[PDB]
Amino acid sequence: PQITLWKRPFVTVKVGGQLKEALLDTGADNTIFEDINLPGRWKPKMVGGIGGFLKVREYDQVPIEIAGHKVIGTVLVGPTPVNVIGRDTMTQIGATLNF
């Protein structure tokens, strides 16, 4: 699609089996969900943001489906106030910003 920005650009995403919703966020380098069920051990990772830095759980080689694209990526689980799809995932589906 071609998405205008009059509202927050939420998209449907299937992440490691579960249908979730998340914000396409071009100012985010990383993809981060709050409370998804992902199998197994995770590695600790730090992530920054406007307010300071958070400890998050890093899960690798997680399948992510957006708009019909199946991709495999790194998914963080952490106390973000909204699920975000970052540039790491958006590059894998060929997303561009256009003006």
Ligand X SMILES: COc1ccc(S(=O)(=O)N(CC(C)C)C[C@@H](O)[C@H](Cc2ccccc2)NC(=O)O[C@H]2CO[C@H]3O[C@@H]4OCC[C@@H]4[C@H]32)cc1
What residues act catalytically?
Answer: 25
Q: Is 9 exposed, middle or buried (0-12, 13-18, 19+ CB in 10 A)?
A: middle
Q: How far is the CB of 1 from its own copies (least distance, A)?
A: 6
Integer Rg of the chain from CA: 13
Instruction: Kindly write out the interface string for residues 32-71 of this chain, putting x where it contacts ligand X by CB under 6 A and - elsewhere.
Output: x--------------xxxx---------------------
Which element (helix H / strand E) includes 49?
strand 43-49
If one asks whether residue 44 binds its own copies (CB under 8 A), the answer comes out as no
If one asks whether residue 27 binds ligand X (CB under 6 A), the answer comes out as yes
If one asks whether residue 71 binds its own copies (CB under 8 A), the answer comes out as no
If one asks whether residue 21 binds its own copies (CB under 8 A), the answer comes out as no
For residue 35, give the nearest of 74, 80, 67 by alpha carbon: 80
Q: How far apart are CA 65 and CA 45, in angstroms?
A: 23
The residues of the shown chain that bind its own copies, judged by CB under 8 A, are: 1-6, 8-9, 23-29, 32, 47-54, 66-67, 69, 80-82, 84, 87, 90-91, 93-99
